[PDB]
Amino acid sequence: SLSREALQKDLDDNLFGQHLAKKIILNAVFGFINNPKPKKPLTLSLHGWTGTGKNFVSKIIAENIYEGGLNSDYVHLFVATLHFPHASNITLYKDQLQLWIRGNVSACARSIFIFDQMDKMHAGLIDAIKPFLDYYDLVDGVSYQKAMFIFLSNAGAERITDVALDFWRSGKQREDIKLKDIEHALSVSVFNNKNSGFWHSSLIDRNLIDYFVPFLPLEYKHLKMCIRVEMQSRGYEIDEDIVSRVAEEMTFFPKEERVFSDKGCKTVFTKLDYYYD
Amino acid sequence: MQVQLVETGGGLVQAGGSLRLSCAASGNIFSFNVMGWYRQAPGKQRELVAAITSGDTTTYADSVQGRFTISRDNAKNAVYLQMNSLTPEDTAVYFCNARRNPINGPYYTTAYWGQGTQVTVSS
Ligand SMILES: Nc1ncnc2c1ncn2[C@@H]1O[C@H](COP(=O)(O)OP(=O)(O)OP(=O)(O)O)[C@@H](O)[C@H]1O
Ligand SMILES: [Cl-]
Ligand SMILES: [Mg+2]
Ligand SMILES: [Mg+2]
């Protein structure tokens, strides 16, 4: 049974450098789960830099709704690069995917489906799930209005970073970045007419995506926070000299200013093995 | 239902000649992610020759490129291998293979194999 306080605490204690995502997710998820008569399944699209917390947030959402999180019987993970790797097999993926979603929602109206690597998913396979996302009361005799769909993607990461870098160079705080700043920078790509058309409802004048959730590239200080957590998780005494040396081995961009981690947090943890026995 | 692959078409071919192998499956093959042909020559381990997805995308081992063509007929539950320009290097037992994979959960492959057909290419 989801609590707003518990979801907020889990986000605040564990998710670093994502002030926009924390707030959007907290209010979108709590408001939907707490609504006994939703009009449409909650559809979230989480976009942004590699290694900055998209699967991590998904686990936080899942574990706050169901015991076991991603291992709950009611939470379903599709990894497009693992499960849907070959474009020419689209029909075989589509047929299995439609059966799987329909059977599980039949059995559990409050099912959760996560589509990871959506930017590598055949557009025709995305088309196959659009009816489940819409404002229909019944789709082939089953209501999807209590279900939740979460998409994870890198598309838009570079543009989102343009905003973060502009704020950094201007002497502004990261937490001053607003959703409107991100939506404006994405007007030419993720938010252009063809994408808006692609994601449009087939029933009323609305988008199938309820919330765009942007993820910002991580700074050096966020990488240090994650290294400290990994040290504790391994049972090490934290050593700030190792924190700095590990973080210094990571590649940062732009070439001149060294502001953001190329890989977010990814690959950092294997470097601890060169500093600990 | 017991689904089985049966290969036919093997035999002796003179060097430079051609041969067509067929595999009939006793059940529907639409849902096989990949079907293909492997070969096992004396004292050697089995190796990929050619493969094809359900949507007809093909690939070939380096040693047969340009000479062999794989094709698939989902409606007739059959896969074929046309072999041209054969040399004694192609002598082997040929096996048809089918692979089925899940769309959720941990990776695995359910594999099916036929009993194989002997191809001998004389010098
Ligand atoms: N913002 C963050 N706060 C705290 N830990 C994080 C954050 N981002 C990543 N991590 C850590 O790094 C690990 C990998 O992150 P995650 O799997 O969420 O990356 P991702 O954003 O989905 O990347 P990709 O786009 O490459 O799939 C997490 O399990 C966690 O340990
Ligand atoms: Cl496949
Ligand atoms: Mg991820
Ligand atoms: Mg090809």
Coordinates of N, CA and C in Angstrom, one line a residue, chain A residues 63-243:
Chain A
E63 N 8.9 -0.6 -6.1 CA 9.0 -1.2 -4.7 C 8.1 -0.4 -3.8
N64 N 7.7 0.8 -4.1 CA 6.7 1.6 -3.3 C 5.3 1.1 -3.5
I65 N 5.0 0.5 -4.6 CA 3.6 0.0 -4.9 C 3.4 -1.4 -4.6
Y66 N 4.4 -2.3 -4.9 CA 4.3 -3.7 -4.7 C 5.6 -4.3 -4.0
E67 N 5.3 -5.2 -3.0 CA 6.4 -5.9 -2.4 C 7.2 -6.7 -3.5
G68 N 8.5 -6.6 -3.4 CA 9.4 -7.2 -4.4 C 9.9 -6.2 -5.5
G69 N 9.2 -5.1 -5.7 CA 9.6 -4.1 -6.7 C 9.5 -4.8 -8.1
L70 N 10.6 -4.7 -8.8 CA 10.6 -5.3 -10.2 C 10.4 -6.8 -10.1
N71 N 10.6 -7.5 -9.0 CA 10.3 -8.9 -8.8 C 8.9 -9.2 -8.4
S72 N 8.1 -8.2 -8.2 CA 6.6 -8.5 -8.0 C 6.1 -9.2 -9.2
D73 N 5.1 -10.1 -8.9 CA 4.3 -10.7 -10.0 C 3.5 -9.7 -10.9
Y74 N 3.3 -8.5 -10.4 CA 2.5 -7.5 -11.1 C 3.3 -6.4 -11.7
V75 N 4.6 -6.5 -11.8 CA 5.5 -5.5 -12.5 C 6.2 -6.3 -13.6
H76 N 6.1 -5.7 -14.8 CA 6.6 -6.5 -16.0 C 7.7 -5.6 -16.7
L77 N 8.9 -6.1 -16.9 CA 10.0 -5.4 -17.5 C 10.2 -5.9 -18.9
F78 N 10.1 -5.1 -20.0 CA 10.6 -5.4 -21.3 C 11.8 -4.6 -21.6
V79 N 12.9 -5.3 -22.1 CA 14.1 -4.6 -22.4 C 14.3 -4.7 -23.9
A80 N 14.1 -3.6 -24.7 CA 13.9 -3.7 -26.1 C 15.2 -4.3 -26.7
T81 N 16.4 -4.0 -26.2 CA 17.6 -4.5 -26.8 C 17.9 -6.0 -26.5
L82 N 17.2 -6.6 -25.5 CA 17.3 -8.0 -25.1 C 16.1 -8.8 -25.7
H83 N 14.9 -8.3 -25.5 CA 13.7 -9.0 -25.9 C 13.2 -8.7 -27.4
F84 N 13.5 -7.5 -27.9 CA 13.1 -7.2 -29.2 C 14.3 -6.8 -30.1
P85 N 15.3 -7.7 -30.2 CA 16.6 -7.2 -30.8 C 16.6 -7.0 -32.4
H86 N 15.8 -7.8 -33.1 CA 15.9 -7.9 -34.6 C 14.7 -7.3 -35.2
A87 N 14.9 -6.2 -35.9 CA 13.7 -5.4 -36.5 C 12.8 -6.3 -37.3
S88 N 13.3 -7.3 -38.0 CA 12.5 -8.1 -38.9 C 11.6 -9.1 -38.2
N89 N 11.8 -9.3 -36.9 CA 10.9 -10.1 -36.1 C 9.7 -9.4 -35.4
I90 N 9.5 -8.1 -35.9 CA 8.4 -7.3 -35.3 C 7.1 -8.0 -35.1
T91 N 6.6 -8.8 -36.1 CA 5.3 -9.5 -36.0 C 5.3 -10.5 -34.8
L92 N 6.4 -11.2 -34.7 CA 6.5 -12.2 -33.6 C 6.6 -11.6 -32.2
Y93 N 7.2 -10.4 -32.1 CA 7.2 -9.7 -30.9 C 5.9 -9.0 -30.6
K94 N 5.2 -8.5 -31.6 CA 3.9 -7.8 -31.4 C 2.9 -8.8 -30.9
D95 N 2.8 -10.0 -31.5 CA 1.8 -11.0 -31.2 C 1.9 -11.4 -29.8
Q96 N 3.2 -11.7 -29.4 CA 3.4 -12.2 -28.0 C 3.2 -11.0 -27.0
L97 N 3.5 -9.8 -27.4 CA 3.4 -8.7 -26.5 C 2.0 -8.3 -26.2
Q98 N 1.1 -8.3 -27.2 CA -0.3 -8.0 -27.0 C -0.9 -9.1 -26.1
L99 N -0.6 -10.4 -26.4 CA -1.2 -11.4 -25.5 C -0.7 -11.3 -24.1
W100 N 0.5 -11.0 -23.9 CA 1.1 -10.9 -22.6 C 0.4 -9.7 -21.8
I101 N 0.3 -8.5 -22.4 CA -0.3 -7.4 -21.7 C -1.7 -7.7 -21.4
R102 N -2.5 -8.2 -22.4 CA -3.9 -8.4 -22.1 C -4.2 -9.4 -21.0
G103 N -3.5 -10.6 -21.1 CA -3.6 -11.6 -20.1 C -3.3 -11.1 -18.7
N104 N -2.3 -10.3 -18.5 CA -1.9 -9.8 -17.2 C -2.8 -8.7 -16.6
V105 N -3.3 -7.8 -17.5 CA -4.3 -6.8 -17.0 C -5.6 -7.4 -16.7
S106 N -6.1 -8.4 -17.5 CA -7.2 -9.2 -17.2 C -7.1 -9.7 -15.7
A107 N -6.0 -10.2 -15.4 CA -5.8 -10.8 -14.0 C -5.6 -9.8 -12.9
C108 N -5.0 -8.6 -13.3 CA -4.6 -7.6 -12.3 C -4.8 -6.2 -12.9
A109 N -5.9 -5.5 -12.6 CA -6.1 -4.2 -13.3 C -4.9 -3.3 -13.0
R110 N -4.3 -3.3 -11.8 CA -3.2 -2.4 -11.4 C -1.9 -3.0 -11.8
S111 N -1.7 -3.6 -13.0 CA -0.4 -4.0 -13.5 C 0.5 -2.8 -13.9
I112 N 1.8 -3.0 -13.8 CA 2.8 -2.0 -14.2 C 3.7 -2.6 -15.3
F113 N 3.8 -1.9 -16.4 CA 4.7 -2.3 -17.5 C 5.7 -1.3 -17.8
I114 N 7.0 -1.7 -17.8 CA 8.1 -0.9 -18.1 C 8.8 -1.3 -19.4
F115 N 8.9 -0.3 -20.3 CA 9.5 -0.5 -21.6 C 10.9 0.2 -21.6
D116 N 11.9 -0.6 -21.4 CA 13.3 -0.1 -21.3 C 13.9 0.0 -22.7
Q117 N 14.8 1.0 -22.9 CA 15.4 1.2 -24.3 C 14.4 1.5 -25.4
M118 N 13.4 2.3 -25.0 CA 12.3 2.6 -26.0 C 12.8 3.2 -27.3
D119 N 13.9 3.9 -27.2 CA 14.5 4.5 -28.4 C 15.1 3.5 -29.3
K120 N 15.3 2.2 -28.9 CA 15.7 1.1 -29.8 C 14.6 0.2 -30.2
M121 N 13.3 0.5 -29.8 CA 12.2 -0.3 -30.1 C 11.6 0.1 -31.4
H122 N 11.3 -0.9 -32.3 CA 10.7 -0.7 -33.6 C 9.4 0.2 -33.4
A123 N 9.3 1.2 -34.2 CA 8.1 2.1 -34.1 C 6.8 1.3 -34.3
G124 N 6.8 0.3 -35.1 CA 5.6 -0.5 -35.3 C 5.2 -1.3 -34.1
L125 N 6.2 -1.6 -33.2 CA 5.9 -2.3 -32.0 C 5.4 -1.3 -31.0
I126 N 5.9 -0.1 -31.0 CA 5.3 1.0 -30.2 C 3.8 1.2 -30.6
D127 N 3.6 1.2 -31.9 CA 2.2 1.4 -32.4 C 1.3 0.3 -31.8
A128 N 1.8 -0.9 -31.6 CA 1.0 -2.0 -31.2 C 0.5 -1.9 -29.7
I129 N 1.2 -1.0 -28.9 CA 0.7 -0.8 -27.6 C -0.1 0.5 -27.4
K130 N -0.2 1.3 -28.4 CA -0.9 2.6 -28.3 C -2.4 2.5 -27.8
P131 N -3.1 1.4 -28.2 CA -4.5 1.4 -27.7 C -4.6 1.2 -26.2
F132 N -3.6 0.5 -25.6 CA -3.6 0.3 -24.2 C -3.3 1.6 -23.4
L133 N -2.8 2.6 -24.1 CA -2.4 3.8 -23.4 C -3.5 4.9 -23.4
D134 N -4.5 4.7 -24.2 CA -5.5 5.7 -24.5 C -6.6 5.8 -23.5
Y135 N -7.6 6.7 -23.8 CA -8.7 7.1 -22.9 C -9.9 6.2 -23.1
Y136 N -9.8 5.0 -23.8 CA -10.9 4.1 -24.0 C -11.3 3.5 -22.6
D137 N -12.6 3.2 -22.5 CA -13.1 2.5 -21.3 C -12.9 1.0 -21.4
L138 N -12.9 0.4 -22.6 CA -12.6 -1.0 -22.8 C -11.8 -1.1 -24.1
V139 N -10.8 -2.0 -24.0 CA -10.0 -2.3 -25.2 C -10.1 -3.8 -25.3
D140 N -10.9 -4.3 -26.3 CA -11.2 -5.7 -26.5 C -11.8 -6.3 -25.2
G141 N -12.7 -5.5 -24.5 CA -13.4 -6.0 -23.3 C -12.6 -5.9 -22.0
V142 N -11.4 -5.3 -22.0 CA -10.6 -5.2 -20.8 C -10.3 -3.7 -20.6
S143 N -10.5 -3.2 -19.3 CA -10.1 -1.8 -19.0 C -8.6 -1.7 -18.6
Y144 N -7.9 -0.8 -19.2 CA -6.5 -0.5 -18.9 C -6.3 0.8 -18.1
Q145 N -7.5 1.3 -17.6 CA -7.4 2.6 -16.9 C -6.7 2.6 -15.6
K146 N -6.5 1.5 -14.9 CA -5.8 1.4 -13.7 C -4.3 1.0 -13.9
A147 N -3.9 0.6 -15.1 CA -2.6 0.1 -15.4 C -1.6 1.3 -15.5
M148 N -0.3 1.0 -15.4 CA 0.7 2.1 -15.5 C 1.8 1.6 -16.6
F149 N 2.2 2.5 -17.4 CA 3.2 2.3 -18.5 C 4.3 3.3 -18.3
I150 N 5.5 2.8 -18.2 CA 6.7 3.6 -18.0 C 7.7 3.3 -19.1
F151 N 8.1 4.4 -19.9 CA 9.1 4.3 -21.0 C 10.4 4.9 -20.5
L152 N 11.5 4.2 -20.8 CA 12.8 4.7 -20.5 C 13.6 4.9 -21.8
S153 N 14.3 6.0 -22.0 CA 14.9 6.4 -23.2 C 16.1 7.4 -23.0
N154 N 17.1 7.3 -23.9 CA 18.1 8.4 -24.0 C 17.7 9.5 -24.9
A155 N 16.6 9.4 -25.6 CA 16.3 10.4 -26.7 C 16.1 11.8 -26.0
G156 N 16.8 12.8 -26.4 CA 16.7 14.1 -25.9 C 17.8 14.4 -24.9
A157 N 18.7 13.5 -24.6 CA 19.7 13.7 -23.6 C 20.6 14.8 -23.9
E158 N 21.1 14.9 -25.2 CA 22.0 16.0 -25.5 C 21.4 17.4 -25.4
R159 N 20.1 17.5 -25.8 CA 19.4 18.8 -25.7 C 19.2 19.2 -24.2
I160 N 18.8 18.2 -23.4 CA 18.6 18.5 -22.0 C 20.0 19.0 -21.4
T161 N 21.1 18.4 -21.8 CA 22.4 18.8 -21.4 C 22.7 20.2 -21.8
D162 N 22.3 20.6 -23.0 CA 22.5 22.0 -23.5 C 21.9 23.0 -22.5
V163 N 20.7 22.7 -21.9 CA 20.1 23.5 -20.9 C 21.0 23.5 -19.6
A164 N 21.4 22.4 -19.2 CA 22.1 22.3 -17.9 C 23.5 23.0 -18.1
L165 N 24.1 22.9 -19.2 CA 25.4 23.6 -19.4 C 25.2 25.1 -19.5
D166 N 24.1 25.6 -20.2 CA 23.8 27.0 -20.2 C 23.6 27.6 -18.8
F167 N 22.8 26.9 -18.0 CA 22.7 27.4 -16.6 C 24.0 27.4 -15.9
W168 N 24.8 26.3 -16.1 CA 26.1 26.3 -15.4 C 27.0 27.5 -15.8
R169 N 27.1 27.7 -17.1 CA 28.0 28.8 -17.6 C 27.4 30.2 -17.2
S170 N 26.1 30.3 -17.0 CA 25.5 31.6 -16.6 C 25.6 31.9 -15.2
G171 N 26.2 31.0 -14.4 CA 26.2 31.2 -12.9 C 24.9 31.0 -12.2
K172 N 24.0 30.2 -12.8 CA 22.7 29.9 -12.2 C 22.8 28.6 -11.5
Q173 N 21.9 28.4 -10.5 CA 21.8 27.1 -9.8 C 21.1 26.0 -10.7
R174 N 21.6 24.8 -10.6 CA 20.9 23.7 -11.3 C 19.5 23.6 -11.0
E175 N 19.1 23.8 -9.7 CA 17.7 23.6 -9.2 C 16.8 24.7 -9.8
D176 N 17.4 25.8 -10.4 CA 16.6 26.8 -11.1 C 16.1 26.4 -12.4
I177 N 16.6 25.3 -13.0 CA 16.1 24.8 -14.3 C 14.7 24.3 -14.1
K178 N 13.8 24.8 -15.0 CA 12.4 24.5 -14.9 C 12.0 23.5 -16.0
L179 N 10.9 22.8 -15.9 CA 10.4 22.0 -17.0 C 10.3 22.8 -18.3
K180 N 9.8 24.0 -18.2 CA 9.5 24.8 -19.4 C 10.8 25.1 -20.1
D181 N 12.0 25.1 -19.4 CA 13.3 25.3 -20.1 C 13.6 24.1 -20.9
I182 N 13.4 22.9 -20.4 CA 13.6 21.7 -21.1 C 12.7 21.5 -22.3
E183 N 11.4 21.8 -22.1 CA 10.4 21.7 -23.2 C 10.8 22.6 -24.3
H184 N 11.3 23.8 -24.0 CA 11.7 24.7 -25.1 C 12.9 24.2 -25.8
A185 N 13.9 23.7 -25.2 CA 15.1 23.2 -25.9 C 14.8 22.0 -26.8
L186 N 13.7 21.2 -26.4 CA 13.3 20.0 -27.1 C 12.3 20.3 -28.2
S187 N 11.9 21.6 -28.4 CA 10.9 21.9 -29.4 C 11.3 21.4 -30.8
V188 N 12.6 21.3 -31.1 CA 13.0 20.9 -32.5 C 13.1 19.4 -32.7
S189 N 13.0 18.6 -31.6 CA 13.2 17.1 -31.7 C 12.1 16.4 -30.9
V190 N 12.3 16.0 -29.7 CA 11.4 15.2 -28.9 C 10.0 15.9 -28.9
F191 N 9.9 17.2 -28.9 CA 8.6 17.9 -28.8 C 8.2 18.5 -30.1
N192 N 8.7 18.1 -31.2 CA 8.3 18.6 -32.5 C 6.9 18.1 -33.0
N193 N 6.5 18.5 -34.1 CA 5.1 18.2 -34.6 C 5.0 16.7 -34.9
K194 N 6.0 16.1 -35.5 CA 5.9 14.7 -35.9 C 5.8 13.8 -34.7
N195 N 6.6 14.1 -33.6 CA 6.5 13.3 -32.4 C 5.2 13.5 -31.7
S196 N 4.8 14.8 -31.6 CA 3.4 15.1 -31.0 C 2.4 14.3 -31.8
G197 N 2.4 14.3 -33.1 CA 1.5 13.5 -33.9 C 1.5 12.1 -33.6
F198 N 2.8 11.5 -33.5 CA 2.9 10.1 -33.3 C 2.3 9.6 -32.0
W199 N 2.4 10.5 -30.9 CA 1.9 10.1 -29.6 C 0.5 10.6 -29.3
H200 N -0.2 11.0 -30.4 CA -1.5 11.7 -30.1 C -2.6 10.6 -29.8
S201 N -3.5 10.9 -28.9 CA -4.6 10.1 -28.7 C -5.5 9.9 -30.0
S202 N -6.1 8.7 -30.1 CA -7.0 8.4 -31.2 C -8.4 8.7 -30.9
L203 N -8.7 9.2 -29.7 CA -10.1 9.4 -29.2 C -10.4 10.9 -28.9
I204 N -9.5 11.6 -28.3 CA -9.7 13.0 -28.0 C -8.4 13.8 -28.2
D205 N -8.4 15.1 -28.1 CA -7.3 16.0 -28.4 C -6.3 16.1 -27.2
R206 N -5.6 15.0 -27.0 CA -4.6 14.9 -25.9 C -3.5 14.0 -26.3
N207 N -2.4 14.1 -25.6 CA -1.2 13.3 -25.8 C -1.4 12.0 -25.1
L208 N -0.8 10.9 -25.6 CA -0.8 9.6 -24.9 C 0.1 9.6 -23.7
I209 N 1.2 10.4 -23.8 CA 2.2 10.6 -22.7 C 1.5 11.6 -21.7
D210 N 1.4 11.1 -20.4 CA 0.9 12.0 -19.4 C 1.9 13.0 -18.9
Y211 N 3.1 12.4 -18.6 CA 4.2 13.2 -18.1 C 5.5 12.9 -18.8
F212 N 6.2 13.9 -19.4 CA 7.6 13.8 -19.7 C 8.4 14.1 -18.5
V213 N 9.4 13.2 -18.2 CA 10.2 13.2 -17.0 C 11.7 13.4 -17.4
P214 N 12.3 14.6 -17.4 CA 13.7 14.7 -17.9 C 14.7 14.4 -16.8
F215 N 15.8 13.7 -17.2 CA 16.9 13.4 -16.4 C 18.1 14.2 -16.9
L216 N 18.8 14.9 -16.0 CA 19.9 15.8 -16.2 C 21.2 15.1 -16.1
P217 N 22.2 15.5 -16.9 CA 23.5 14.9 -16.7 C 24.0 15.1 -15.2
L218 N 24.9 14.2 -14.7 CA 25.3 14.3 -13.4 C 26.6 15.1 -13.3
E219 N 26.8 15.9 -12.2 CA 28.0 16.6 -11.9 C 29.0 15.8 -11.1
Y220 N 30.2 16.3 -11.0 CA 31.2 15.6 -10.1 C 30.7 15.4 -8.7
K221 N 30.0 16.4 -8.1 CA 29.5 16.2 -6.8 C 28.5 15.0 -6.6
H222 N 27.7 14.8 -7.7 CA 26.7 13.6 -7.6 C 27.4 12.3 -7.8
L223 N 28.5 12.3 -8.6 CA 29.3 11.0 -8.7 C 29.9 10.7 -7.4
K224 N 30.4 11.7 -6.7 CA 31.0 11.4 -5.3 C 29.9 10.8 -4.4
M225 N 28.7 11.4 -4.4 CA 27.6 10.8 -3.6 C 27.4 9.3 -3.9
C226 N 27.4 9.0 -5.2 CA 27.1 7.6 -5.5 C 28.3 6.7 -5.2
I227 N 29.5 7.1 -5.3 CA 30.7 6.3 -4.9 C 30.6 6.0 -3.4
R228 N 30.2 7.0 -2.6 CA 30.1 6.8 -1.1 C 29.1 5.7 -0.8
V229 N 27.9 5.7 -1.5 CA 26.9 4.7 -1.3 C 27.5 3.3 -1.7
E230 N 28.2 3.2 -2.8 CA 28.7 1.9 -3.2 C 29.7 1.4 -2.1
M231 N 30.6 2.3 -1.6 CA 31.6 1.9 -0.6 C 30.8 1.3 0.6
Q232 N 29.8 2.0 1.1 CA 29.1 1.5 2.2 C 28.4 0.1 1.9
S233 N 27.8 0.0 0.7 CA 27.1 -1.2 0.3 C 28.1 -2.4 0.3
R234 N 29.4 -2.2 0.1 CA 30.4 -3.2 0.1 C 31.0 -3.5 1.4
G235 N 30.6 -2.7 2.4 CA 31.1 -2.8 3.8 C 32.5 -2.2 4.0
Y236 N 32.9 -1.3 3.1 CA 34.2 -0.6 3.2 C 34.0 0.6 4.2
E237 N 35.1 1.0 4.8 CA 35.2 2.3 5.4 C 35.4 3.3 4.3
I238 N 34.5 4.3 4.2 CA 34.6 5.3 3.2 C 36.0 6.0 3.3
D239 N 36.6 6.3 2.2 CA 37.9 6.9 2.1 C 37.8 8.0 1.0
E240 N 37.7 9.3 1.5 CA 37.5 10.4 0.6 C 38.6 10.6 -0.4
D241 N 39.8 10.1 -0.1 CA 40.9 10.2 -1.1 C 40.6 9.3 -2.2
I242 N 40.1 8.1 -2.0 CA 39.7 7.2 -3.0 C 38.5 7.7 -3.8
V243 N 37.5 8.3 -3.0 CA 36.4 8.9 -3.7 C 36.8 9.9 -4.8

